[PDB]
Every structure is written in structure tokens, then in C-alpha cells.
Symmetry: C3
Subunit: 89 residues, 3 copies
């Protein structure tokens, strides 16, 4: 059963409306009906103390795409990628 993994990297100090962006992302994920999310905190990072936050979502491609369309209206740096995975039931 084919799915996409969506991985989002951002900083903990990143804000949306003064409030933590990663919390806002997890909350949009939930409001959109995503199957789930897992959030990690790193110990070190750089892109281009403010620690990496990483979200992983495994969902149907259509759902990841819908979420991507929301993420688009948000200015943060970090990184977004997807990858194909096979979910086992």
C-alpha cells in the first residue's frame, strides 16, 4: 500500500502569528484530517538555542498535496521533501 512520507524541517524559534510554527503545522495537519504526525527535536542543525524541529507525516499523496498547498502561503526557510513508502497493515 503506497503512500508518501512528507518531511518538514524548520527551527523551533520560527513563528506564525507570534506563536510556534511547528505547533501551528501540527494543528493544521490535524484539522485537515491527516492520518497522523510525528514531531522530533534535534540537537544540532543548519540550513540555507534554535534547535531543529522535524515533522513526519505518512499519508495518501492527495492529502500530502493538500497540506503542501497550505504550507505554500507560509514563509519559513527549512526544508520540505516527500518520498514514496510502503505502509504495512
Amino acid at each position: 500500500h503506497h503512500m508518501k512520507l512528507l518531511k518538514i524541517y524548520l527551527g523551533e524559534k520560527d513563528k506564525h502569528s507570534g506563536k510556534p510554527l511547528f505547533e501551528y503545522l501540527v494543528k493544521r495537519a490535524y484539522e485537515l484530517g491527516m492520518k497522523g504526525v510525528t514531531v522530533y527535536r534535534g540537537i544540532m542543525g543548519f540550513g540555507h538555542p534554535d534547535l531543529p524541529i522535524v515533522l513526519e507525516i505518512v499519508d495518501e499523496e492527495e492529502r500530502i498535496n493538500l497540506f503542501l498547498k497550505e504550507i505554500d502561503n507560509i514563509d519559513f526557510d527549512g526544508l520540505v521533501f516527500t518520498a514514496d513508502v510502503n505502509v504495512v497493515k
Copy 2:
């Protein structure tokens, strides 16, 4: 050198025989002769304080499959997926 990544997401409060399921998984992994395992703890998650636990195993497909056959007899929710990776020697 082709391998599979197997990724398992579960809750920290999940139990097998009253004892922590993630510890039981790591222990089966070891008893089966898996090449390795890495275990992470998240800071937030949801599916469908109890924090996400994630296991990653990179191994031969045959081995991941054998492990899958054990995981099948266990009732937990969470998520299991595999993905192709290329291991460098």
C-alpha cells in the same frame, strides 16, 4: 547495495505483557539477528504523556519480512512502513 528501511511508530505507553512494547520490539529485533536498530523519542504526535517512539531498522528485505511476520501477531496501532535505501560500505 540495496536494502530496506523499516520504520515503526508506536506510543511509549503501549505494552506487551504489561511491559514496554518498544523494548520488546528492540529485543525481538536483536534475537532475530537484525543488523541493527535505532530508537527515537518524539516530542509530539497523533495517529489513527504518551510520546511517540520510532524504531528504524536497515536490513536485507528477507530479514525485514521475517520481522514483519512477528509484528503481525501483535496488536498495537501506530504505523509501519518500508522504503528502499542504498547502503554505502
Copy 3:
């Protein structure tokens, strides 16, 4: 936009010139002009307290390859793999 994910697993107690190897890796990554790195610490692991350290780099294949050529001169155990991902802009 195709990229590679490079994932490196090593122990926290691993050393390069008496100094922590993971810090040395992150520092080479930066000196080579990698697009970024994210570093995680696990809670448990085995291969074949010394906790897993995991680095993730998402970059152009050419860059990951160049980094691989440096990693080659270093003796540590752990694990290195790559995987194809699609970065969204």
C-alpha cells in the same frame, strides 16, 4: 526537484582525533558547502551510555557523493545510506 537524503548513524562516544565524531562530521558538512544538516540523538540502538547519533543531509547527489569520499577515510562502524527524495520549493 530530485535530491538525495544521506543518513549517517554512529555512536555518541565515537571519536575523531580524540574529539566527537558527529561534531566533526557536521563541521565537514558545513565546510564542503552542504545545503544543510540535521542531527538527532536516539534513546537506544545497536549495530554490527553510548547513544545513537543520526545525521540527515538533503542535497544534490554530486554533493552527497563528495561528502561520501571524505567519510571513506574515516574508520567508524554505524551505518550510511542514501535514498531519493523530492524536495518541494
